Amino acid sequence: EIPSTNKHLKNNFNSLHNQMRKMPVSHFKEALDVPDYSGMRQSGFFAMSQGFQLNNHGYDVFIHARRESPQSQGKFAGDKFHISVLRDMVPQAFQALSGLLFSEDSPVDKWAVTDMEKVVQQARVSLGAQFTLYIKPDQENSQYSASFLHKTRQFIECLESRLSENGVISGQCPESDVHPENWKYLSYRNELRSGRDGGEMQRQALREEPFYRLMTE
């Protein structure tokens, strides 16, 4: 149909899944020279760490992180993840994940974390979904490569294990997202085909997203 990133996943659904399941473990050299959560909130107008431009300048309640996109990279296709932890443990969770989030090997060029001092405690992005990781197709024609999907899945699974290994308590996953039982913190939604309001109907549609299935099955 019109071709698009998702059309490609649908038509190469099994090829991608099979290629991914044959690849060797991904390795991410974690960064050490990174800010802690307090440092992140001090980003203000502008800060830099491992190539990620940081800012906590205002408008919204988040601290943003963005590394320059490769010329070979495609256009955002809606795929993204949230990370939900106990509200009280966001600073510790951030620190635990910093080495991966700022990694020169990370597949995620853009992400954001809630500034807990800018939101009310009972807020949707306060009780959970305190991190948002944006994914985009890695190939010039806006298609996902098997290599990149495997790397992304490996990365999200590393985030999961790091938080669990740190014994971080889980948060309240947003109604908008879906996640399998083995993801205790991560959740997913595609912003091109879903909104922020929950509903089993939207979760149902999301569960059928080829990208989500490739990330979980």
Partner: peptide, 7 residues
């Protein structure tokens, strides 16, 4: 102000 959107 609390929107997790990409833009």
């Amino acid at each position: 102000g609390e929107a997790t959107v990409y833009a």
